[PDB]
């Protein structure tokens, strides 16, 4: 996951008009997009 820094590099090359060698024909950046471990959920708020 985490593409915002590569997006920042692309936004910087766009100030000079430069293009990547893949020319935006690629898909899915490296590593799984798994959230932070051990998450909680809400209490038994539903009525008896």
């Amino acid at each position: 996951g985490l593409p915002d820094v590569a997006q920042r590099l692309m936004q910087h090359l766009a100030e000079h008009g430069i293009q990547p060698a893949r020319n935006m024909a690629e898909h899915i950046p490296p590593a799984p997009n798994w959230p932070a471990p051990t998450p909680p959920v809400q209490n038994e708020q539903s009525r008896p």
Binding site: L2, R8, L9, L13, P20, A21, M24, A25, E26, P30
Partner: protein, 73 residues
Amino acid sequence: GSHMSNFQHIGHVGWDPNTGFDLNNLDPELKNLFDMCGISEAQLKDRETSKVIYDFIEKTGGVEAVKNELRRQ
């Protein structure tokens, strides 16, 4: 006009304005970003192209800055 001679936050890498990035001195964590964008080693050996790319590294504060920026969550 032109930039000031501070040179306090520069990125240590084998880049030169005469040939671009040295592959033997290219950082593997800085390469994470280059590859995510779709950049080839041919673009890294072009003077004018690699001069645009290197600007981003020294701009954030050298290689240790980009090596931390992609490490954020």
